[PDB]
Design an enzyme around this catalytic site. Structure first.
Site, PDB file in Angstrom:
ATOM      1  N   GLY A 124       0.826  -1.223   0.000  1.00 11.82           N
ATOM      2  CA  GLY A 124       0.000   0.000   0.000  1.00 11.82           C
ATOM      3  C   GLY A 124       0.852   1.262   0.000  1.00 11.82           C
ATOM      4  O   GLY A 124       1.789   1.329  -0.807  1.00 11.82           O
ATOM      5  N   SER A 125       0.571   2.229   0.874  1.00 14.61           N
ATOM      6  CA  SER A 125       1.225   3.562   0.890  1.00 14.61           C
ATOM      7  C   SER A 125       2.751   3.437   1.040  1.00 14.61           C
ATOM      8  O   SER A 125       3.471   4.372   0.609  1.00 14.61           O
ATOM      9  CB  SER A 125       0.655   4.417   1.989  1.00 14.61           C
ATOM     10  OG  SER A 125      -0.633   4.899   1.648  1.00 14.61           O
TER      11      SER A 125
END
Length: 285
Positions: free
Chosen positions: A52-53
Site C-alpha cells: 500500500g502507501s
C-alpha cells in the site's frame, strides 16, 4: 540481533496487539549500516500483505530519478478515471507538490507520476529495493499506490533500509555483522537523501510516530491482508520508517493485523526510541 531490543520489541508488540485486540502484530528492526536483522518479533494468537502507501516514496524517487517531474512541480490531484475506475484520494486537493503527495498519501499524485513513465520504471525500482505484455492504465496506477501487489515486513524493512543508506541495497543478515559491508548502489544518493527528508515531513504532520530527541522519517498506511494467495476483506495497519534522519541507523517496520487508523505509528515511536536510547545513538532533534 540485539536481545535487549528483541525482548523489548516482543513486549511492545504484545501491548499493541492486546490493546487494539488485533489478531496479531509483527515488528522488524534492520540495522541500516550492515543489513543484520536486529529485532524480529510476532505475537502469536511473517505472513504477507499489500505494501500500500509504503511504496509511494519509491514512486516519487523513481519519477525524480527518471526526470519526468521537476522537484518543485505542482501535480494535478483533481479526480480522474483509468480503465473506467476512478482514482480516489483519502485527503483530496486540487494541486499537490511532491512533498504533499507523500504527506497527503495521494493515490492520484502517484498514479499521474506512474503514467509519466514506462511500467518498467517502477518495476525496476521495486526490484532494486527488494520488493520484487503491455499494461492496462489502471494496473500502471495501482502498483504506484501498492494495491494488487504482495510484500512481507522484512521486505519493507530492507526497502526502507535502502532509503536509510541513501540508495545502497545491503542484503539482510541474521548473523551478527560489523561495518563495512559490500552492497550494490541502486538509487541516487541526492534523491534518496531528499525522499528521507520528505519522509521526515510525513513523520511530523502525523505526530504519533515521532521520537523524543531524534528526527524520525516514516510512511503510515492501511491495506488488505493476503491469506492463502488472495486478498481478504481484513485490514492491516503499518508504519515503516528510518531514524535518526541526520545519520540513519535503523530501518523499522511495524504491522498489526485486524485492529478492532494511526495505531501502528505510536508502536513505531516506542520501539524506535527504546532501540535508539538503548544503543546510545546521539540525539539530533
Amino acid at each position: 540481533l540485539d536481545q535487549r531490543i528483541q525482548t523489548m520489541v516482543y513486549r511492545e508488540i504484545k501491548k499493541a496487539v492486546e490493546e487494539n485486540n488485533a489478531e496479531s502484530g509483527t515488528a522488524v528492526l534492520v540495522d541500516v549500516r550492515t543489513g543484520e536483522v536486529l529485532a524480529m518479533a510476532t505475537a502469536p494468537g511473517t505472513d504477507t500483505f499489500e505494501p500500500g502507501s509504503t511504496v509511494k516514496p519509491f514512486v516519487v524517487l523513481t519519477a525524480l530519478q527518471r526526470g519526468v517531474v521537476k522537484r518543485d512541480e505542482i501535480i494535478d490531484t483533481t479526480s480522474f478515471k483509468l480503465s473506467g475506475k476512478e482514482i480516489v484520494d483519502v485527503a483530496p486537493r486540487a494541486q499537490q507538490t511532491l512533498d504533499e503527495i507523500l504527506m497527503n498519501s495521494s493515490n492520484r499524485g502517484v498514479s499521474r507520476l506512474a503514467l509519466r513513465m514506462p511500467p518498467s520504471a517502477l518495476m525496476e525500482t521495486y526490484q532494486n529495493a527488494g520488493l520484487s505484455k503491455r499494461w492496462a492504465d489502471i494496473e500502471r496506477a495501482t502498483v504506484a499506490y501498492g494495491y494488487g501487489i504482495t510484500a512481507t515486513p522484512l521486505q519493507i524493512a530492507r526497502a526502507y533500509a535502502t532509503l536509510g543508506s541513501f540508495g545502497v541495497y545491503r542484503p539482510l543478515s541474521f548473523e551478527k555483522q560489523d561495518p563495512p559491508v559490500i552492497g550494490k548502489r541502486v538509487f541516487s544518493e541526492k534523491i534518496t537523501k531528499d525522499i528521507v527528508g520528505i519522509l521526515e515531513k510525513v513523520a511530523i504532520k502525523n505526530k504519533r510516530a515521532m521520537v523524543e530527541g531524534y528526527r524520525v522519517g516514516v510512511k503510515t498506511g492501511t491495506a488488505r491482508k493476503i491469506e492463502n494467495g488472495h486478498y481478504v476483506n481484513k485490514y492491516v495497519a503499518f508504519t515503516a520508517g528510518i531514524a535518526p534522519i541526520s545519520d540513519p541507523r535503523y530501518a523499522l517496520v511495524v504491522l498489526i493485523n485486524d485492529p478492532k487508523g494511526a495505531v501502528s505509528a505510536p508502536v513505531f515511536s516506542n520501539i524506535m526510541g527504546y532501540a535508539l536510547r538503548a544503543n546510545a545513538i546521539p540525539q539530533d532533534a
